[PDB]
Amino acid sequence: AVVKCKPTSPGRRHVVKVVNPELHKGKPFAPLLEKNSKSGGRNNNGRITTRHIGGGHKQAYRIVDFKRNKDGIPAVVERLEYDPNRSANIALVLYKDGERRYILAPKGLKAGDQIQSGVDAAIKPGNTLPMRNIPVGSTVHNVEMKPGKGGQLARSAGTYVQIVARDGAYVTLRLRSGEMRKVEADCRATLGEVGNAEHMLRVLGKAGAARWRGVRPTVRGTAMNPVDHPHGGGEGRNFGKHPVTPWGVQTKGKKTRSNKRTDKFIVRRRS
Amino acid sequence: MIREERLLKVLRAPHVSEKASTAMEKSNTIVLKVAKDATKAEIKAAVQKLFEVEVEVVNTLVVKGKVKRHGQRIGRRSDWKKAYVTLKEGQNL
Amino acid sequence: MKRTFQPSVLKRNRSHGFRARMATKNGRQVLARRRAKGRARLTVSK
RNA sequence: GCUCGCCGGAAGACCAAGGGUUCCUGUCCAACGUUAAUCGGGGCAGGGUGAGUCGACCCCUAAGGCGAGGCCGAAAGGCGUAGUCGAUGGGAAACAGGUUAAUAUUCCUGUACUUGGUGUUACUGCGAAGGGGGGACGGAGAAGGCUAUGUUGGCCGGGCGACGGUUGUCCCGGUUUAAGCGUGUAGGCUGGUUUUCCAGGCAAAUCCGGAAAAUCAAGGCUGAGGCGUGAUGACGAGGCACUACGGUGCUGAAGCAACAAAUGCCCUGCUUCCAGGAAAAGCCUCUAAGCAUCAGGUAACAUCAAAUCGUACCCCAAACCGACACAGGUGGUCAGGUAGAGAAUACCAAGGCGCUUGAGAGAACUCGGGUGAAGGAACUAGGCAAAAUGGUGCCGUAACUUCGGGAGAAGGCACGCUGAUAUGUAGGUGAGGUCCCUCGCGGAUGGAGCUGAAAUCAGUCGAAGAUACCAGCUGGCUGCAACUGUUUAUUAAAAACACAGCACUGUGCAAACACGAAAGUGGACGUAUACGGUGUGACGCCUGCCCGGUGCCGGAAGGUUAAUU
RNA sequence: AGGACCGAACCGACUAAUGUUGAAAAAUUAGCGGAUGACUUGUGGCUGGGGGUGAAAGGCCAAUCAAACCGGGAGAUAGCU
Ligand SMILES: [K+]
Ligand SMILES: [Mg+2]
Ligand SMILES: [Mg+2]
Ligand SMILES: [Mg+2]
Ligand SMILES: [Mg+2]
Ligand SMILES: [Mg+2]
Ligand SMILES: [Mg+2]
Ligand SMILES: [Mg+2]
Ligand SMILES: [Mg+2]
Ligand SMILES: [Mg+2]
Ligand SMILES: [Mg+2]
Ligand SMILES: [Mg+2]
Ligand SMILES: [Mg+2]
Ligand SMILES: [Mg+2]
Ligand SMILES: [Mg+2]
Ligand SMILES: [Mg+2]
Ligand SMILES: [Mg+2]
Ligand SMILES: [Mg+2]
Ligand SMILES: [Mg+2]
Ligand SMILES: [Mg+2]
Ligand SMILES: [Mg+2]
Ligand SMILES: [Mg+2]
Ligand SMILES: [Mg+2]
Ligand SMILES: [Mg+2]
Ligand SMILES: [Mg+2]
Ligand SMILES: [Mg+2]
Ligand SMILES: [Mg+2]
Ligand SMILES: [Mg+2]
Ligand SMILES: [Mg+2]
Ligand SMILES: [Mg+2]
Ligand SMILES: [Mg+2]
Ligand SMILES: [Mg+2]
Ligand SMILES: [Mg+2]
Ligand SMILES: [Mg+2]
Ligand SMILES: [Mg+2]
Ligand SMILES: [Mg+2]
Ligand SMILES: [Mg+2]
Ligand SMILES: [Mg+2]
Ligand SMILES: [Mg+2]
Ligand SMILES: [Mg+2]
Ligand SMILES: [Mg+2]
Ligand SMILES: [Mg+2]
Ligand SMILES: [Mg+2]
Ligand SMILES: [Mg+2]
Ligand SMILES: [Mg+2]
Ligand SMILES: [Mg+2]
Ligand SMILES: [Mg+2]
Ligand SMILES: [Mg+2]
Ligand SMILES: [Mg+2]
Ligand SMILES: [Mg+2]
Ligand SMILES: [Mg+2]
Ligand SMILES: [Mg+2]
Ligand SMILES: [Mg+2]
Ligand SMILES: [Mg+2]
């Protein structure tokens, strides 16, 4: 559910929360947890290479089964869980032979549901199959770009991909960006949409809410001095320049894709 | 079994002070100056050999040398180890 | 007020100590210069 | 020595860091000490730091570092795998009393505890670089149960008062006791056991996970505190004797209860929220290659060992960082009384200090303050500064509003003491007693004693009762920025920055983009509800026309056009 | 519940006076803002000079910053004093 907070303080006046009370209120499942320390957007030269990253809350990494490789063995959903690492919720599933795993929670899945992967799985949300065994016209998510590599496409909350065509050993996918893209028909996908579609309705309400997420403030280029940024300087407010990145590249319209290796898989750019 | 050559080298001097006199007269402890790298076991074996008294226990400490002057010249006396060796109540060294 | 020199012996030794100097070639060149000058104290170690 | 004054959430006490003899004793007063100095953190000489249990060392890992091979790079070197380091975190064990001029959880006394090495006896499947479990973790909030501690009473010892009174409902003091061991309490968590079986735990496993059964229902874990013991002890108000008048020697009474009570403990609990909250070892357990009436396990006992290094002293400071014996700076721990909401504040305790020039005088003027006739902002750039308001309870409170606010709006009334209600109330606490027993640290009834606000009605003193300290000035119109935040360390705190929100735009993942000759790394163990860039800046109503110029996007016919040939 | 309210510790630094060969190369005193958070603080670590870092003041990078400090080219050059 989506809920507006009452304005008992200015920082709460605009807060809109997305509360899922289906989500397990306890601790995660420990065998599937790793530590992940923060970077502050710094690389192994110790330099900031992505701006505006730092602070925020401590988070453990949940090992999530993006490969969905346990074929023929059904699993039951034990519970849905909050995952701080990603917008989608995750679902702890228990396979019949006793193995527990985490998967991306698709829309509509709840505790008690049965799921399956393989060439024989039934066509229902949460089931994983190669896209040559999935009917053209299906909505899928967690789509592989190479067979056996694991899902890389349509993983974020509420996303999905549509299988629009199949030509021999390749399928044509319509991705959430609007791009039509070729992918080998031997790639696996999970049926349904990714759940938690109300994710995008939340309103942070205050600066500190973005700080909790490890986002540091953005200083506008025009607020700096010429030595700092191409937009810098000028008495009062002045621009008189085509807008650019901090490193001098046009930032309103200029395209930056350059990959002749993967051009052949793009059937139609997103426009 | 520590070597007798090792044992003959670790007891340097007996320490003479009011605290040492009172350790002898109140606790049956003798205060010695021992070799800087002397261990408690070595000091104990050396006293049990060369002074021929039974040793209950050895306590040790390192005295740091003072800074002194000499004709407008700074210098430093050596560190040196002190041992409180306790005898067994009736040994009477 | 807080002045610039705030001592820590660990940080001193890690930053300027004998082994830190020996860890890199430019550090060894520091030690070489200081020996050729005849410093009585090569490093902050002693 | 006697008085006086000052600090007392510190100006007391203990640490860490840092310093390093500044510690204690004798002697000396040249220089040092902003004066003198017989004194000193000064000179000189001597003394002083005692550990199986405290800390380091050690086992273990975090960020991060280094990094055999390796990948990369003119050289130097960069990055990184196996590994190996790295605390600010995890991992065994000791307390009370006494004692030195100067050390003490280290010495002594008394009473404990931990780990390992052996050496026997007894039952004996042990074995890991591998599996599982555990260690193991957030914020906020609520309430109970406690303790530290305090107050009173009882008890014990002492007193009978330099001036009216003081044998009493009078005065003073003391009334302290640990770790450990036994007990498993308030309370928190979990159903327990026993079987068959299995695409999971890189092999295996009797373990873990999963399934299916029968069976039994209180078993298991955790746990403050209390009680018993430790303890006939120690300590102990005082008294007595020496004094080398600095203190030691000897002796020692009471050693109880009730009430109040933490920010400490139970509690790494419980409840709840979203921003979803280390690792590795020690530890338990499972087995593999292997050893197999051998090694090895368990328990008992006996005996060994527990090394080395630190330990003095300062430590919100004259001993550290500031050139100074410098109104500065410096992390942690302890937390008494009266009043008070309080760690504010005032006065005090324990304790520690009077700040290393003094003596006079009592001009201008300067500094820090007190008071002020009449007037009351006339001052001035400006009410700058000052003056003023100030507490609690209750009455009462406007435009407007995003319905939360505005609001402590504004304005007002009461307020000390004594007595009664009620020889101390409402309430809290709760003994003996009686009863019951899933028989105890049990539970019910019982209410003695203790503690105890508020109010109302009378009376009463002062000019004044929130009496000191402490402690909002208030209202009206208007610009700007929504707001809490941030900023020019050292003349600018703002209308500047940020901001949630909005939009454009890039980006299909070996992403765009960024650091990097490169290898790589960040972005991200993310995947378009995502990520980068840019502008705008909550919210409400909105956001019109221009593609000529410049940029960007698309386009591919024609002209122009490089190396090349 | 809250980047909620009042208010100490703690963090800051709005006004005035003093001080300006200071007690102090930035403080003292009286007032002042925040005070459960975008808070504050200890220890250790990483980023290195046309480079870092910057809720952006050209701020800060050891009392030094529109290009740190040390050493070197180096006795730069100086139609100027
Ligand atoms: K500007
Ligand atoms: Mg950004
Ligand atoms: Mg933004
Ligand atoms: Mg500017
Ligand atoms: Mg430029
Ligand atoms: Mg302008
Ligand atoms: Mg213009
Ligand atoms: Mg020692
Ligand atoms: Mg000296
Ligand atoms: Mg002294
Ligand atoms: Mg003299
Ligand atoms: Mg003098
Ligand atoms: Mg001296
Ligand atoms: Mg001993
Ligand atoms: Mg590492
Ligand atoms: Mg390396
Ligand atoms: Mg190599
Ligand atoms: Mg190690
Ligand atoms: Mg540590
Ligand atoms: Mg002492
Ligand atoms: Mg008590
Ligand atoms: Mg508190
Ligand atoms: Mg000491
Ligand atoms: Mg002084
Ligand atoms: Mg001072
Ligand atoms: Mg105070
Ligand atoms: Mg005067
Ligand atoms: Mg005056
Ligand atoms: Mg006046
Ligand atoms: Mg007047
Ligand atoms: Mg008047
Ligand atoms: Mg008037
Ligand atoms: Mg006027
Ligand atoms: Mg005038
Ligand atoms: Mg004023
Ligand atoms: Mg005033
Ligand atoms: Mg105007
Ligand atoms: Mg503002
Ligand atoms: Mg503000
Ligand atoms: Mg300034
Ligand atoms: Mg500042
Ligand atoms: Mg200012
Ligand atoms: Mg990559
Ligand atoms: Mg605006
Ligand atoms: Mg703007
Ligand atoms: Mg607040
Ligand atoms: Mg402080
Ligand atoms: Mg002040
Ligand atoms: Mg405020
Ligand atoms: Mg406040
Ligand atoms: Mg500076
Ligand atoms: Mg330059
Ligand atoms: Mg030259
Ligand atoms: Mg010259």
Author numbering:
A (entry chain c): 2 to 272
B (entry chain s): 1 to 93
C (entry chain 1): 1 to 46
Task: Quote what the paper states about this structure.
Ribosomes synthesize natural proteins by catalyzing amide bond formation between an l-α-amino acid and an l-α-peptidyl oligomer linked as esters to the 3′ termini of A- and P-site tRNAs, respectively. The reaction occurs within a region of the 23S ribosomal RNA (rRNA) called the peptidyl transferase center (PTC). Here using cryogenic electron microscopy (cryo-EM) we determined high-resolution structures of the wild-type E. coli ribosome in complex with full-length tRNAs acylated with each of the three aminobenzoic acid monomers—Apy, oABZ, and mABZ—and accommodated within the A-site of the PTC. Our structures reveal that, although the ribosome is capable of accommodating aminobenzoic acid derivatives within the A-site cleft, the distinct sp2-hybridized backbone of these monomers and their positioning within the PTC fail to trigger the conformational changes associated with the induced-fit mechanism.
